[model samples]
Target chain A: MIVKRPVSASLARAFFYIVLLSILSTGIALLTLASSLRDAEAINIAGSLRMQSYRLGYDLQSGSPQLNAHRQLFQQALHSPVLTNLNVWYVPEAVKTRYAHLNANWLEMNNRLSKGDLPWYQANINNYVNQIDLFVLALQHYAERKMLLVVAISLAGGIGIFTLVFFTLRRIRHQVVAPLNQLVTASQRIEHGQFDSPPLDTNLPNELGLLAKTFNQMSSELHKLYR
Target chain B: MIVKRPVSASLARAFFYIVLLSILSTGIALLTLASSLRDAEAINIAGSLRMQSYRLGYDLQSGSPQLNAHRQLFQQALHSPVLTNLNVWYVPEAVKTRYAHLNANWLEMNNRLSKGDLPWYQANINNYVNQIDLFVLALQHYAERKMLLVVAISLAGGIGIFTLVFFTLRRIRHQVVAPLNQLVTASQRIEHGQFDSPPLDTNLPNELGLLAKTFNQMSSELHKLYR
Candidate 1:
C-alpha cells in the first residue's frame, strides 16, 4: 500500500524506454551501413587515380597529342568531390594522411611533366603509382571499418538485449512465479475446507501485492468464523 | 527461501538461454547474407543469356561460319550450373518458374535456329530476351529479399529485447524497488527511537523477506524491553 501507482502506468513507462532503445539501436546499425554507401564511390575514384597516374606516365613516354588532356583528367580525379570529402574529421587520420601524400606527390609529378623531364617522371612513376595504391588501400580499409562497425553494433545490441531479458526473467521467477505458486497452494488448502491457510506475500507493490493482501484477509476471516 | 537454487545458478541459466538466442539470431542474419552470395553469379549468368540470344540471332542472319559454335555456347550458358542451382527447393517459386520459362523458350528457339528460320528467331528474340530480363529481375528481387529479411530480423530482435526489458523492469520496480524503499523508511523511524514501528511484510521469499522478518522481531523485542 505504501507504493502507489497503476500497474498500467508502470508498464507503459518501462515499455517506452525499452522501445526507444530498440529503435535507436536498430536505426544506428542501419545508418552505419547507409553512411558507407558513398564509401564505395570514394574508393572507386581513388582506384581510378591509380590508373590515371599510369596513363599520365604513358602520355609522358609516348609524346601523345592529348598529354594536356590526360594531365587535366588526372588532376580532376585527384580532387574529385568524393575523395575530397574524405578530408572531413570523421575519416581516419591515416586515410587523410594518405590522401595528402598522394596529392603532394602528384603536384611534384605534374611539375616534372610540364618541364618535359620524362626521364625523372619515369623514374618516380612506379613509386608514385605505389603511393596511389596505398591511398586506395587506406580508403578500402576505411570503408571496411564501417562494415565492421555495423557488425559490432549488432553484436552489442544482442548482448544488451540478452542481459535485459535474463535479469528480468530471473527476477520474475523469484518474485512473481514462485509467490504465485505459493498463493495457489494456499488457496487449495482453503478449498479443502481448511481455513488456516498461511499468509501470502503482501509486500509487493503491484497487482500481485493487492491479490496477496485480499487473499490473506479472506483466510483470516474464514479462520475466525469457522476454526 | 523456498526456492533453494543458488542465485548464481539461476542467473547463469537465464543468461545461457538469452545468450543462446542472441547467437542464433545474429548467426541466422549473417547466414542469410552468406547464402545469397551466389545470387550475384546467378544473375550475371542470367544476364549473359540475354546477350547470347541476341548474338545467336546475329549469327543466324550473318551466315557466319561460327554459327554452330555460337549455338553450342548458347546451350552451355543456358544450362550453366549457376543458373541450374536456382531450381533448388529453398528458392522462391517465381524465380524457379521464370527460369523454367526461359529454359523452355530457349529449347524452342534452338529448334528454330536449326531449321535456319531467321525470321522466326528474330521475331521471337525480343520476347525471349525480355523473359531473360524478367528472370534476372526475379533473381535481383530474391537477393533484395534477403537484405530485407536481415532488416526484419534486426527489427524483430529490437522489439523482443524491448518487451523483455520492459516487463522485467516494471516487475522489479514494483516488487523490489518500492518494497526496499519502504524497508528503509521503517528503519529510519526505528533509528529515531520509535521502538513501536509497524511490522514489515514478511511474506517475500527473497533476501528482503528474511530481512523484514529480522527487523520486525528486533522492533518487537525493543518495544517490549523499553516501551
Candidate 2:
C-alpha cells in the first residue's frame, strides 16, 4: 500500500532553482566586471602614451632654440621601455606605428626649424602636424572600438550565462527537488498509518526510484502486520 | 544499525562549501575588475583632458604674431567648460581655484604683452607660467591620491564580502547537509529491518528533528509487531 502525505514539491523546486540561479548570476557578474577592468586598463595606457606624444610635440614646437634638446627628450619618452609596460592588449599595432611616425616627423621638423632654415621647416611642418593629428585620431578610434567591443562581449556573455544557468536550475528543480519532496511526503504518510492508496510507480534506475520501491514495501509490510 | 549510502554528510557539506566558495570567488573577481576599470577610466579621461588643454595652448601659441596669444589660450583653456565633461570624479574646489588664479595671471600678462609692454610682460610671465605649472602638478598629485583611495576601498570591500559569504556557506553546509545526510542513512538502516538500533540524534530544531523522533517511534512499533 502507498500512503499520501503533505509535501510541497513546488517549494523545494523553487529553492533549488533559486540557489542555482544565484550561482550563475554571480559568475556572470564577475566575468563582466573582469572584462571591463581589462578593457579600461588598456584604454588608459594607450591614452597616456598618446598624451606623451602630444606633450613631446608641444615641447618641440616651443623649444625653437633648443630644438635638438627637445627632440631628444621626445625620442627618449617614446623609446622608453616603460611605455611598453602599459596594458596594450586591445590597442592595435597600427596605432603605435602612427605615434612613432608622428614623433619622427616632429624631430625632423624641429631640426630644420632650429637651424634657421624657415623654408625647409615650413615645408615639413604641415606633414609632421598632420601625422600627429592622424595619430591622435587613430588612437581615439582604436580606443573607442576596443571599449565598445569589450562592453558588448561582456554584456552578452553575462546575459547568456545567466539564462543558461537559470534553465539548468529549472531542470534540476524539476528532476531532483520535486521528486525528493514527494518522497518525503510519501514517507510521512506511511508513518501516520495512511496506506489506503496504491504505491508510487517506482520502476526506474535513479535514487528516487529506489526510494519509491523501498517506501512501498515498508508500507505494504506495515499494513499486513497491522491487519 | 549503520547503513552505507552513496551520499554522506561530509560529502554534502563539501559540495555546499564548494558552491559557496565559487560565489565568493566570483564576487571578489568582479569587484577587483570594477576597481581596475574605474581607475583606468579616470586616468584615461584625465589624460584626454590634459591633451585637449595642451592642443588648445599649442594652437593659440602658434596662431598669433604676438606672444600674448599663448597666455590668452592658457587662460581660456584652463577655464573651459569642456573639462567638466571628461568624466573624472572628485576634483577638489581648490584645484579649480588654482586654475582660475593661473588664468587670471595669464590674462594680465597677455594684456601687457599685446600693448608692446615687454618689461611688464616679462616681469609677470614667469610667475604666470609657474602658477600654471603648479596647477598641473597639483592636479596630478590629487588624482594619484584619489586613485589610491578608490582602489583601496574597492579591494577591501571585495575581500570583506567574499569572506562573509564564504563563512556563511560553511555554516550552512554544516547545519543543513550534515543532518540531512544522517537522516538519509538512518532511513536506509530502518529499511533493512534493523530494529535493534535507535535512530541517530540530529539535534536539529526543524522538521528533521521531528522526523528523527518519528523514526524511533516507528522502529519501536515494528519491533513489537515482530515479537
Candidate 3:
C-alpha cells in the first residue's frame, strides 16, 4: 500500500495561524470585558448620585423631626464604605435650613388634623408630591440612559467571548489534532516489520519535519535488513 | 544495538488524553462566561424596575397642575417595552383622575399667582418638591444594589478565566511539549545509525513510550543491514 506523506509545511502553517488567531481573539475578548465593566461602574455612580439628591430634597420638606431622623440615616449611609465610595452630592446647609422652616410649618399644620385640617394637609401633601414628581421625572431620564449603556456593553462582551472561544477551538482541532493523528498512523505502519519502503516525507520546516526525516531514514535501513 | 518494539497502544492513549484535556478546558471556560452573562442581565432588569417605581411614585404625588403635565410624561414612559413587560400593579382610572385633578389645580393656582397670590404658588411648589424626595430615595437603593452585583460578577469571571488559561498552558508545556522535544532528540540520534543500544525506555503509558520503542526497532534493523 502506498502510504500518503503528511503535508508537514501546510500543517505547521496551519498551527501558526491557529495560535495567532487564538491569541488575537482572547485579547479582544479581554478588552471587551474590561470596557463593559467600566461602563457598568459609571452607571452605578450616576444612579447613586441621583438618589442622594432625592433624599436631600425629601429631608428638607419633612419638618424638624423628620429631618433629624433623615440626618441620622444619611450619616449612617455616608459612613458606609460602599455608599461613601460613590460620587454623591450632599445638600448644602442653606438649602437644608430653608427646607427646615417649610417642614416645621407643614408639621404644625399636619398636627391639627383632628381639628378638621383636611384642606391644609391635602394642599401641603399635593405640593410635596409635585416636587417629588419633578425630581423623579428628571432622574428617571438619567437612569434609563445609564441602564441602556450597561446592558449594551454586557451583551457585547458576552458575544465577543463566545466568538473567540468558538474560533479558537475550530483552529485547534483542524491544525494541531489532525496533523498529530497523521503522524501517529505513519509511525504504526513502520512497525511490525512493514518497513518495505522509506517512511513518507512530511515536508515541514519545524521540529515535526525534522522528526519525519529521521523516521524515514530509519525505516529505509530497516527495510534493507529485512530484505 | 538492542532495538525495541513500537508501543502503539501507549501512543494512541496519549493522543486521546491530550484531545480530551483540551476539550474539557474549553468547555469550562465557556460555561463560566455564560453564567456571568445571566447574572449581569438580571441586575440590569432589577435596576430598571426600581427606577420605574420611583418615577411612578413621584408622578402620583405631584398635586393637580404639575401632576397633569407629569401624567403625560408617565404615559409616554409606560409605553416603553421595559415598563410594559414588568407586569406591575397599575390602576388606569385612578391614574387618569389624579392627572385631571392635578391639571385643574395647576391651572387654578397659575391664575391665582397671576393675581399676585405668591403664598399659594409657594405652597404648591414646596409640596411638589417633597414628593420628588421619596421617589429619589427608593431609586437610590435599587441602583446601589445593581452596581455592587455587577462589580462582584465581573471580577469573579475575570479571575476564573485567568486561572483556567494559566493552568492549561502549563499542563500542555509540561506533559506534551517536554516529552515531544525529547522524542525529537532521540530520533536525531537514531538517524546517524547509532543503533548500538536500545532507546531510553521512559516506561510511561503514552506517545513518548511508543516513540522510544519505534526508534529502537529501526536502529536494530539498520545495524543488521550494514553488517
lDDT of each candidate versus the true structure:
0.66, 0.49, 0.43
**lDDT for B136 (candidate 2):** 51
- Lowest-sum lDDT 10-residue window in model 2 chain A: A1-10
**Candidate 1, superposed: residue stretches over 4 Å from native:** A4-17, A184-192, A196-198, A203-207, B1-25, B28-227
lDDT of 2 by residue, B43-117 (tens): 343445444444433444455343345445545555455444332344577766775675566556556555656
DockQ (model 2, Cα): 0.19
lDDT of 1 by residue, A167-213 (tens): 55565566555665665556556656777555787887754565466
TM per prediction: 0.52, 0.58, 0.49
Q: Is candidate 1 or candidate 3 better by lDDT?
A: 1
Stretches > 4 Å off in candidate 2: A1-72, A86-91, A113-119, A136-213, A223-227, B1-82, B86-198
Off by over 4 Å in 3: A1-171, A195-201, B1-84, B88-147, B193-206, B220-227
Best of the candidates, TM-score:
2
The CAPRI classification for model 2 reads as incorrect
Choose the strongest candidate by lDDT: 1
Higher-DockQ candidate of 1 and 3: 3
Give per-residue CA lDDT, model 3, range B110-202, as digits (tens): 365336443454456445433333323333343344444554454444444444445544544554455566666666655565555445665
